[PDB]
Design a protein around this ligand. Structure first.
Ligand SMILES: Cc1cc2nc3c(=O)[nH]c(=O)nc-3n(C[C@H](O)[C@H](O)[C@H](O)COP(=O)(O)OP(=O)(O)OC[C@H]3O[C@@H](n4cnc5c(N)ncnc54)[C@H](O)[C@@H]3O)c2cc1C
Ligand SMILES: Cc1cc2nc3c(=O)[nH]c(=O)nc-3n(C[C@H](O)[C@H](O)[C@H](O)COP(=O)(O)OP(=O)(O)OC[C@H]3O[C@@H](n4cnc5c(N)ncnc54)[C@H](O)[C@@H]3O)c2cc1C
Ligand SMILES: [Br-]
Ligand SMILES: [Br-]
Ligand SMILES: [Br-]
Ligand SMILES: [Br-]
Ligand SMILES: [Br-]
Ligand SMILES: [Br-]
Lengths: 394, 394
């Protein structure tokens, strides 16, 4: 079996990269460990930046999003009994964010790939990478018992945080930067109309809470919870009671509750590896870095890695400029670090930490009061939230 | 002995408050523990905000400052081998800062007070405060053996961090917020021309360094040093060698060194007490709060406390509106907390901390890269550095 670019992982990163590549005439094969249905069952991202929206249009898979996605011009932050709106559109110079579920984006890409007839192997078991530094690397996997070999020119690891690609790079060649937060997010998806037309991030003494949405009739809520928690300890009603307690009274009053469609706990983490490549293997998305969800950057950062990888591969194949691929990591890491900094800042100002002294609690409150009350402060939040510009390359 | 307002402490706070009060016809007596010469020997602040400059003009003591003070329109921050200038004047909407030594400001006020004939008792030993909640509080002190009593209406504690006034408030009535940093600043005053026309804050792997000045022929330099250090371990040459190592090569090359006129280690601390008053006792300046020197806010915050106290006392005496004095703390604390937040931020991004992991070191560097490269980020530094506006009252 032979292709030009082997892609490990059929989550949004691998699918978007494969679609862009296919449209440009660069043959590619995607290998996924799970089934199509499993990938589709993952409830994740809800907020997309402009850059991600444009990339989807470039890949020609934006029809449904343009029709169903909600365009938001602001977000709200509640703390110490007050709600402050950040006018993203005004303060960022006209940019906005789009609410369109990750399951939707994934469905759209999967449908697009199937129609094009591009190769996707689901349930590709025990994927292994070989000859990463050679001229001709290859991937071995198992499909119903028999070990098959796939030859390629380049391999893009889009297999997420627990994928095989990052583990395939000699450990000594990588520098890992990581921070684990002492809390996670308990999320609940409900078929109820959202409590607000815009998102509400709330810093409350009992802990962080976030009111989000998926459509006019589907909502997504999260509450900060310690790492000791098990999802089975949280009935739907306990969640609603806890959520209501962390929100301002006028918001909790008009809250329409209902049975959960999905409920899960996501641990918060910051993680970055340098470099993001090794020989003919290039990491993209969650395979290379993780951000705590507070800044809604994860999927958006994956889009820029992919945008960068696609452009460089195009240069390599169409223009014979293969040397440009060495700049991949330098280019991506500039954007990754700034988004990591923003996500870390958002996280530290909105969550309640366990070992916090009086001075720190006051500084946290003051950070909010300052940034939400200063035009310059508001602009730093807004420009970061809508997404910093992509680097053009060369 | 009787007066209207008793002032404990003849440092800049007490002197400025007494001058403003005297000019408005409110009699006041200042009690100082040390001698005039001792106070004058303290090398401290070099950077003044516009608000402090205007207050000095209001007190009619700005002749020398207007002539000798240097007006700065920008400051530089060096990190990771690059120097970035923050145009304070441009980014703050036209405000600047003035470099004029604290010893100078103090000399000017002392000369002004002596000429006016206002009462100042130096070497006032063992000052004690009594009847703080009564209608007629009083102060007892010792002048050459005999205990004297001074009756007054109000007492302003301008006695600094180690003064008696804050200790005179029942501990249970106060909330203390404090953070002690694991380092101090080793400062050196030299009669040499400064290395730059504007200040240079430097984040270096070996530690923080700051290039400041007092005039065209007098410089003030600081280097971060751990708390274990004794000033006698640092000869003038060891200081210069260490300073040069922390600065960019092109700066260290043109550095004119020389013998020290003063050398001392200042420990870094953040400290705030709430409230800042008790009965007829009002705290102002270092007596109520301390900030690490990184943001050049200490003396400037004292000026706003004083400006606020003076205005309220004026209302009380001239307009019979004594009830307004209850708002003193609420008013001051709003400004104090924002300046504390700024000083803490500046400190955390410019200094090298001992127990720092790889992720944090990267976040520190990224904080700098982001704030120094974004117009919105630069504006948050600039508006805070020049000083946030004073609240007008009522
Ligand atoms: C609570 C939460 C909220 C979020 N909210 C947002 C938000 O609003 N906005 C935003 O920008 N981001 C958000 N994200 C982040 C976003 O969901 C992720 O960054 C995104 O899923 C990354 O996509 P990916 O394709 O890189 O990896 P993944 O989605 O993890 O997909 C990787 C794929 O690779 C496959 N795979 C793994 N190992 C192997 C293997 N060995 N062989 C073959 N295949 C393998 C997996 O099965 C999976 O399908 C959120 C995340 C969470 C958890
Ligand atoms: C290294 C350093 C750099 C600084 N740089 C700057 C800068 O550039 N800009 C800026 O804004 N700020 C800066 N400052 C801060 C500034 O110097 C102080 O905030 C300022 O000195 C506060 O003045 P004050 O009058 O409140 O108190 P102080 O200057 O401490 O004076 C208080 C007085 O009260 C007296 N006293 C004490 N106890 C008693 C008692 N029991 N009875 C009677 N009298 C008593 C003392 O003897 C003293 O004279 C710096 C400080 C340091 C240490
Ligand atoms: Br979703
Ligand atoms: Br995220
Ligand atoms: Br970004
Ligand atoms: Br001085
Ligand atoms: Br200071
Ligand atoms: Br200020």
């Amino acid at each position: 079996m032979k292709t030009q670019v082997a892609i490990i992982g059929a989550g949004p990163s691998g699918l978007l990269l494969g679609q862009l590549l296919h449209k440009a005439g660069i043959d590619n094969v995607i290998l996924e460990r799970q089934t199509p249905d499993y990938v589709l069952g993952r409830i994740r991202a809800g907020v997309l930046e402009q850059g991600m929206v444009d990339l989807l249009r470039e890949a020609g898979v934006d029809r449904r999003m343009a029709r169903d996605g909600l365009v938001h011009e602001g977000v709200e932050i509640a703390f110490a009994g007050q709600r402050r709106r950040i006018d993203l559109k005004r303060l960022s110079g006209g940019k906005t964010v789009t609410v369109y579920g990750q399951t939707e984006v994934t469905r759209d890409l999967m449908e697009a790939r199937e129609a094009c007839g591009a190769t996707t192997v689901y349930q590709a078991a025990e994927v292994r990478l070989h000859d990463l530094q050679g001229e001709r690397p290859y991937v071995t996997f198992e499909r119903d018992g028999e070990r098959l070999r796939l030859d390629c020119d380049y391999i893009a690891g889009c297999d997420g945080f627990h994928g095989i690609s990052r583990q395939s790079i000699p450990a000594e060649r990588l520098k890992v930067f990581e921070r684990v937060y002492p809390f996670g997010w308990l999320g609940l998806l409900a078929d109820t109309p959202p409590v607000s037309h815009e998102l509400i991030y709330a810093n409350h003494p009992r802990g962080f809470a976030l009111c989000s949405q998926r459509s006019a009739t589907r909502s997504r809520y999260y509450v900060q919870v310690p790492l000791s928690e098990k999802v089975e300890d949280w009935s739907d009603e306990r969640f609603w009671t806890e959520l209501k307690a962390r929100l301002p009274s006028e918001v909790a009053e008009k809250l329409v509750t209902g049975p959960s469609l999905e409920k899960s706990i996501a641990p918060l983490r910051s993680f970055v590896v340098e470099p993001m490549q090794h020989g003919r293997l290039f990491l993209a998305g969650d395979a290379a870095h993780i951000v705590p969800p507070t800044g809604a950057k994860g999927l958006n950062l994956a889009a820029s890695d992919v945008s960068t990888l696609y452009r460089l591969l195009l240069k390599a194949y169409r223009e014979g400029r293969g040397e440009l691929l060495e700049r991949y990591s330098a280019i991506c890491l500039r954007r990754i670090w700034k988004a990591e900094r923003f996500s870390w800042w958002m996280t530290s100002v909105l969550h309640r930490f366990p070992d916090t002294d009086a001075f720190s609690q006051r500084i946290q409150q003051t950070e909010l009061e300052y940034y939400l009350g200063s035009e310059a402060g508001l602009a730093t939040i807004a420009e970061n939230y809508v997404g910093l510009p992509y680097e053009e390359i060369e």
